[model samples]
Target: SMDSRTKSKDYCKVIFPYEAQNDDELTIKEGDIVTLINKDCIDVGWWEGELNGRRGVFPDNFVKLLPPDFEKE
Candidate 1:
């Protein structure tokens, strides 16, 4: 059985640029690949990910989920 935390898809590719409005948020650019770490247990709109070693939250809609086998371009 697979849990939500152990997702088959562990990364996301940014499709829209997003600027972090809060300290807990991430400033992401289009085409940037983020290593998705977690999603809110309450099913919130934000998700946790890391880019360039900086981990933070960002709107889920800001990026498209990628399969675990997907390679970075």
Candidate 2:
């Protein structure tokens, strides 16, 4: 999770509900799980992360957020 002091990065789960539709867009196959390091840091409706050793921003609505409550020293 992301915050003022806690950004142990890539500490959450995010699943793509659909496959990637383009080459430039972040390619996430349907039902694929990726590292979600920043959900709160966004521009309107985009989240940032990486998959397959690729880093890019994708739409927020296209993903399903999973959780486990990440916050610590």
Candidate 3:
């Protein structure tokens, strides 16, 4: 449920359909569930959380905000 109003400042993580290799080189689609891990408000805008225990940077646009009832949370 992430909208245009959700900026890097507010997001902590992003989920994409395809596995992301790099921060700026990610290929994502709408409805992809992204997890917010860290928001430094300085570099990379937002940081990707541990996916299956792996950490990295993900694009904010590729991520969708999950509802409170989302089981992933």
Candidate 4:
């Protein structure tokens, strides 16, 4: 399900599994556990998040839905 608000360029969010350094790939598959690290976030759409021990902004498409027992803490 692609978010309707994702069409705007002003929305600064990271697309996971990034192949390029700047382009948004959104390639993270399901069942992947992305770890968080030190990042910055100050804007409304700015998502300075991390994934798989790597730090970056993940897009909505990159984040897949997981099962209940996918990542039990």
Candidate 5:
């Protein structure tokens, strides 16, 4: 269901080529998991998500939208 897909357990993996310079930006590694905090707040190329309890907008290009069942351990 669409409701379940945006739950707390839903996370995306960072695939960025840059690190954070502020609190609004999610600082994550290549394998770090971040949950979508506001799926409807995405504006153009940016998206809002939560990582480590911090929430803000990060570039959509910085992550690959990952599902809970994404392959790998």
Candidate 6:
């Protein structure tokens, strides 16, 4: 069985591009709308999200979150 992943209304805009430095990261570009998955802390400064159907952890500070009720255009 497949494990369930968390989904939320929290969407974010990529303010800065992030190139994956390892296998567990998603390379994101500016203006990319990322569907936030895990926001579980900043002590280590990593947040999880999905972009273009790919999921991985990225720097939390690198993105700017859109309004909670923002719709996709």
Name the best candidate (by TM-score): 6
The whole-model C-alpha lDDT of candidate 1 against the native structure comes to 0.80
TM-score against truth, every candidate: 0.74, 0.56, 0.43, 0.32, 0.61, 0.75
Off by over 4 Å in 6: 1-7
Clashing pairs in 2: none
lDDT of 4 by residue, 1-73 (tens): 3222322122222334444256331223344554322223463332443443344555445544344444423
lDDT on C-alpha atoms for all candidate structures: 0.80, 0.58, 0.47, 0.38, 0.66, 0.77
* Superposition error at 64 for model 1 (Å): 0.5
lDDT of 4: 0.38
Q: Could you give me the TM-score of model 2 versus the true structure? A: 0.56
lDDT over C-alpha atoms for residue 71 of model 2: 33
Order the candidates by TM-score, highest first. Answer: 6, 1, 5, 2, 3, 4
Best by lDDT, which number? 1
Q: Write the residue-wise lDDT of candidate 3 on 1-73 in tens digits.
A: 3223333433223444656666533344444444555543565544454344344555554566555555442
Provide the lDDT at 38 for model 1. Answer: 74
Off by over 4 Å in 1: 1-9, 71-73
Candidate 5 residue runs with Cα over 4 Å from true position: 1-9, 40-42, 68-73
RMSD of 4: 12.2
Per-model clash counts, in order, read: 0, 0, 9, 5, 0, 0
**Residue 13's lDDT in candidate 1:** 88
TM-score of 1: 0.74
| Candidate 6 local lDDT, 33-64, one digit each (tens) | 78777775653777888888778888878998
Q: Write the per-residue lDDT of candidate 5 for residues 3-66, one digit (tens) a residue.
A: 3332345467788743566876766666787666665353777777776666777777888888
